[PDB]
Amino acid sequence: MKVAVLGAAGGIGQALALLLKTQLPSGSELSLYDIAPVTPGVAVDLSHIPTAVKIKGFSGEDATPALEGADVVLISAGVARKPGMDRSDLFNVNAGIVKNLVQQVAKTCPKACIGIITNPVNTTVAIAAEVLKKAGVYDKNKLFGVTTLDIIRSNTFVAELKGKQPGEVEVPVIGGHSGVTILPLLSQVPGVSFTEQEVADLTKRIQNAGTEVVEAKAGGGSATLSMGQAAARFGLSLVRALQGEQGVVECAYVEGDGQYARFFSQPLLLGKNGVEERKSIGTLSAFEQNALEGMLDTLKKDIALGEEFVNK
Amino acid sequence: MKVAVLGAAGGIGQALALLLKTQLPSGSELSLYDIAPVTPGVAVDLSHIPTAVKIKGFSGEDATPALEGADVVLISAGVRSDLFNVNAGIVKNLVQQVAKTCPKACIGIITNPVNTTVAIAAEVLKKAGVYDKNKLFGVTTLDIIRSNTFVAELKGKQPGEVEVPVIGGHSGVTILPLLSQVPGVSFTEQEVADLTKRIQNAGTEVVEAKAGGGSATLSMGQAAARFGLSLVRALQGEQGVVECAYVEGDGQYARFFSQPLLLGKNGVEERKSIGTLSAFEQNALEGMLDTLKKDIALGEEFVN
């Protein structure tokens, strides 16, 4: 299988590429692409690690050589924080980058599975889908918003609270990937219960966890290493499914049946063609039902913004 | 076991901390230190990964809180004559903090130029009265993993199964891959000269391909993680853990010299023979001695 990382020179992209060079199955190929001129040197640095994963890097404006033959494209390009740029400015920069890179995908490797890491995922996945539909190549089973950082953060905070081994906790997290749209289903964690205060407190922590890192970095950066790790979990899961492994399940933000919104994160069985089955969210507690209903207005507006970005 | 990374905010340090957060044994502790103000948040970013390694990060001038109870300290801190002096002074400072807070730790020096910075570390520890030659290592593992990669590619081998001993020092002609000792593979004279040149210049290869954006960081993080995980395995009592590293040994060639080491509960358990060298390797070893000895002297003079 061949994986392309678009945005490979950034902090997320370098962490993701290091993890993929060391954990992709033997005989995989990895390409790195970013406008930054350092990118071929990022790939040469990684090529010195003795795993059976061939790696090459590419720069300039044209991602084609990285995309040729790609089975999975992970798009982590964009900016989290830049001097002088406020939320709207960052959104327009990231939206523009996603629109450009997904158009390159649609041209070169339109049958690849695509994982959008670039934030804000609630909107950038809708931009990606609109670009793909315009190209006439959209497959709703092959476009994912990578929401895995919310899952691994939830696993960490629940294992700390509940006195569990961190690698043994798995929290389902549904909805979207920002603020009140992130819905950790603490009611479905087996073996334990939470008080209403613990649910409110953990949900708030999970929904604001990105700030927690910005703050400790004295405003000097944002979550990059954990995002790299989260993206590698999702990329390696998709690779295993694409190679034929069965029973691989991950939550991700995908276009679904529209019960709640056009795009929605829910547990997915993955298979050889991307999503194999969109699994039910299961039973919700009263707090979860209310938080779900409460955020749908916001999530639907996020989605609409991506649609309107691509045309206007 | 507790591992401290000093220089954690840098490219090497962040890559190394990511690998250690995910690969240290359950129940381990990892502390990150760097004067960069970002450091405490580099640890918070990593603390969101759900593995049973507790992580904390520290900034400011005092590495004490990171070094308390540390069993292994990996020093990747740094950043032509002014560049050397800055990096030398950073190693001299950090090794002095190690000598004060965790003098019984195993110390891996990653900061370049290793051939010289290990000598600076040794003289600092000697001046503090806590120098243990079994516990101070120059981390040369990047040369080993590069040699493995390049041999595996040339000879069509599984790269994870190839293990090339590399001896000498960690820069240019002082890097000596013992290609003659790789089981199940044979090399022409041309291949030996070409592989040796590529290994010796691999650091430049990366710098060149990075076009201004710096040197090897991600593969150096992997190399240092391999070496630090081997030290932890040995400290915990695992048998048969062998790694090449630059250490103060018998002085047959130079005061410090990288050779295969059996690791154990107290750092080096045994310094192993370099074994039989081919004629090409013997002439490469003889040819590097004056350079290596000058590198060592530069570090000694820097402290003394």
From Swiss-Prot, chain A:
It catalyses: (S)-malate + NAD(+) = oxaloacetate + NADH + H(+). One of its GO terms (molecular function) is oxidoreductase activity. The active site is at 177 (proton acceptor). It holds the Pfam family Ldh_1_C. Its EC number is 1.1.1.37. Changing residue 209 to P: In strain: MB001D. SUPFAM superfamilies: LDH C-terminal domain-like, NAD(P)-binding Rossmann-fold domains. Disulfide bonds: none annotated. GO terms for biological process: anaerobic respiration; fermentation; glycolytic process; malate metabolic process; tricarboxylic acid cycle. The keyword Iron-sulfur does not apply. Substrate binds at residues 81, 87, 119, 153. Homodimer. This is Malate dehydrogenase.
